[PDB]
Design a protein around this ligand. Structure first.
Ligand code: HEM
Ligand code: HEM
Ligand SMILES: Fc1cccc(CCCNCCc2ccnc(-n3ccnc3)n2)c1
Ligand SMILES: Fc1cccc(CCCNCCc2ccnc(-n3ccnc3)n2)c1
Ligand SMILES: C[C@H](O)[C@H](O)[C@H]1CNc2nc(N)[nH]c(=O)c2N1
Ligand SMILES: C[C@H](O)[C@H](O)[C@H]1CNc2nc(N)[nH]c(=O)c2N1
Ligand SMILES: [Zn+2]
Lengths: 407, 411
């Protein structure tokens, strides 16, 4: 019931008790581990509210207070009566910070308590959403000095009136198939790009075209908007040793902003809750750039380096991967845009694990996602045992809105 | 119940039915995943079901299920158990057993090779000197002058748990580690404790940075004894680099034969507590873990210095850069001396074809992603991108406690 986690590089052992608060299921059983699988009414609502409020009031040291009892009373009254309820701003902010705190796949959680939360629960239309989003983009971008933020749209009601951002991130590049058969731009987004076009977008059909926003308010058909270009901070990619690196013509955007998740607080569901922090270099340089089904540039780069691409055992892929990643970091640093390397990021997360074990009795973590996609065992998270489990408030996935939307 | 795994690079979805045969537990529950936790005297009672299930599998695999030969065997095992309390495996069953334990080892990336495994039957062995002789023969046969051959040597099974055969070394070949009075370590820090026991037991330690450890062997529950592997049987490779000439001057070498000697082999309910096995190395075992783990030889600093990388900021990726060089060096050195080795690209790609083949012929392949993905360059190998289901099948290789923690000394 009380579980140990050991670090095998340092011999440090932590006892997890937080997991005994876990609520939702993992996908594993005692016969089978699903650790590596990417995706494994009034009556329901009141227990959820209660459990949330109890943790809120305990966090502010008024557990069992009149105000605590008054609040459960009032919420209960409101559910009974209205069959949903409204969070106080303070509960909303607490909820958001804790969903991030509980996100076991996020390596950046040492920052969890410095989150700017923008309350967009008064929003009613897609123009309104667009406005909130641009303000979010500009506030978080902060001219290169990035600041974490989340903007929270109204919560689900009958599920006929959902707010959704159709983009998976606020900022991504488009994807186009050539008659050629190959893919121009980001192959991850070829479908979303199609939906934009079939909805009205005039694509410039380039390699790095910032996609339009596709915003749905109150369950209406979504609408298109171009983020003012001047709010989209982009970084040209050069290498500090290889002059020819810049001729590859690569750039990435500064703002990493996930927009397709569902935020659950005290049983309430916020289907549009775009959030943003800042990049760990490997996301772009290892995944965005070198995934086979992404920009997949390893071959072009190894070429330019004149490596022996004849046998896998020269480690030419490995060599090129490192250079690319050095360049990403160098470029963001030279242009003064916040970025973190995988060494620094994982070392900070180890320190956060320690704080969490000590002050909270644990920290849910997904080893498969936390260990960087390059140089695994030379980062300390590789050697750290982690327990993965689901605590609420949480961010969850939800189906792509195009599959659910009734047109 | 059918379970799907998906490869997110290729979109290949596979369907697992084999996990239905899984008996032992994982460590996980519906409420906690322990997929990254390293570690999450049998009675007649439990034993016949375990024998039965095994012999059913053996007879199926040979297209003789339900045959008279099948029934007579169950029959014979059943009477052997009730009367003697244990039973003896046929050679054919032992062979099938050892191969399937490898086939089922979900932390092994090398399993495309599972059906080519030389099994040495050492069940007639009685003494430590007997064990030493068996182990020398295995090393010579596996090494094969650089052209490595997978092998396993199986010592007598556990009886009452008071007469166990054990190899006290964790691997047949490993370098000594010595803690110095100033706190630094000479040689391999992973082997300081075991080195100390060898010394206590009478080993004259040369005290260098690459001293091959003696064998510490326990037969029949007796106190174990020391033997030095003939050095002519210990194939080693000096490490140099194809471009960098100062690399040789680091004075690195490694041995060629990777041989696990501390696992327990379970077959049909029998426990083989000494069952050393060996294949050949994937480059990263040595170049990433042995050389660059902080708690192992840890050469990253000295390497990067010599490369004169900017070392004052982690964001130079100086560490990542030295790491690739060292790994090229290891693969270069082995290929040049014609000692079998495989890079992590080649190995993982072969594993994916193995794993696919296993779903089509067998209905699954248990696999531990945390261990299968290589410890450098994870996502530029096809395994990173492969979903995997991990579960326990027997026959199997299991961990067991270190014998110095449990051994009852005779004097
Ligand atoms: C401050 C800098 C931050 C860093 C360096 C960071 C780092 C990361 C990384 C590397 C991932 C994995 C992404 C992937 O492989 O797809 C991730 C996922 C995630 N992060 Fe963060 N994060 C940061 C801020 C935030 C904030 C502000 C939130 C929420 C308020 C958040 C919540 C999450 C969630 C929910 C995931 C999982 C997304 C998914 O499953 O696709 N993070 N984080
Ligand atoms: C033929 C070449 C082989 C290769 C390239 C290979 C590769 C590997 C690697 C890289 C590991 C992980 C080692 C670690 O990180 O600690 C491993 C583990 C393992 N391999 Fe192999 N292997 C091979 C042959 C064998 C053979 C012959 C057997 C048994 C007959 C075997 C059974 C296992 C087992 C049981 C493990 C798990 C060890 C542990 O938990 O400590 N492998 N293999
Ligand atoms: F399980 C899955 C199957 C298919 C896709 C998927 C989502 C992968 C994308 N995760 C978010 C990537 C991303 C992008 C920008 N920013 C962040 N970000 C910002 C702060 N923390 C994360 N994260 C999961
Ligand atoms: F769960 C654990 C906690 C602590 C240590 C541990 C074992 C680590 C060593 N793994 C074996 C390494 C090794 C060495 C030589 N050869 C092989 N080898 C040969 C064939 N397959 C693997 N493997 C597990
Ligand atoms: C199959 C496997 O779960 C999948 O490839 C995972 C592996 N680890 C990951 N880790 C992170 N951070 N992000 C990812 O998208 C993935 N993908
Ligand atoms: C804590 C964690 O599970 C531990 O470091 C594991 C990670 N993955 C590994 N993978 C391999 N192949 N070998 C190992 O020793 C480990 N160690
Ligand atoms: Zn699990």
């Amino acid at each position: 019931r009380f579980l140990k986690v050991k670090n095998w590089e340092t011999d440090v052992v932590l006892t997890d008790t937080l997991h005994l608060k876990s609520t939702l299921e993992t996908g594993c059983t005692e016969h089978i581990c699903m650790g590596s699988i990417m995706l494994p009414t009034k009556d329901q609502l009141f227990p959820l509210a209660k459990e949330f409020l109890d943790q809120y009031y305990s966090s502010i040291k008024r557990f069992g207070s009149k105000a605590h009892m008054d609040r459960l009373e009032e919420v209960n009254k409101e559910i009974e009566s209205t069959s949903t309820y409204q969070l106080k701003d303070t509960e909303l902010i607490y909820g958001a910070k804790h969903a991030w705190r509980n996100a076991s796949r996020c390596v950046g959680r040492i920052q969890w308590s410095k989150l700017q939360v923008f309350d967009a629960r008064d929003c009613t239309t897609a123009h309104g959403m667009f406005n909130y989003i641009c303000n979010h983009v500009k506030y978080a971008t902060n001219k290169g000095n990035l600041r974490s933020a989340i903007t929270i749209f109204p919560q689900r009601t009958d599920g006929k009136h959902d707010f959704r951002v159709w983009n998976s991130q606020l900022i991504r590049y488009a994807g186009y198939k050539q008659p050629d058969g190959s893919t121009l731009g980001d192959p991850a987004n070829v479908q979303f790009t199609e939906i934009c076009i079939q909805q009205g977008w005039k694509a410039p059909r380039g390699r790095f075209d910032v996609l339009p926003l596709l915003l749905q308010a109150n369950g209406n058909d979504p609408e298109l908007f171009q983020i003012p270009p001047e709010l989209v901070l982009e970084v040209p990619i050069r290498h500090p040793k290889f002059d020819w690196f810049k001729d590859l013509g690569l750039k990435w955007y500064g703002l990493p902003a996930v927009s397709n998740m569902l935020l659950e607080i005290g049983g309430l569901e916020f289907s549009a809750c775009p959030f943003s922090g800042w990049y760990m270099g490997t996301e772009i340089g290892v995944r965005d750039y070198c995934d086979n089904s992404r920009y997949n540039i390893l071959e072009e780069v190894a070429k330019k380096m004149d490596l022996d691409m004849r046998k896998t055992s020269s480690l030419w892929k490995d060599q090129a991967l490192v250079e690319i990643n050095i360049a990403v970091l160098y470029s963001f640093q030279s242009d003064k845009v916040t970025i973190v390397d995988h060494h620094s990021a994982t070392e900070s997360f180890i320190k956060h694990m320690e704080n969490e074990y000590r002050c909270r009795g644990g920290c849910p973590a997904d080893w498969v996602w936390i260990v960087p996609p390059m140089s695994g065992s030379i980062t300390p998270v590789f050697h750290q045992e982690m327990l993965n489990y689901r605590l609420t408030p949480s961010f969850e996935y939800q189906p792509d809105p195009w599959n659910t939307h009734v047109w």
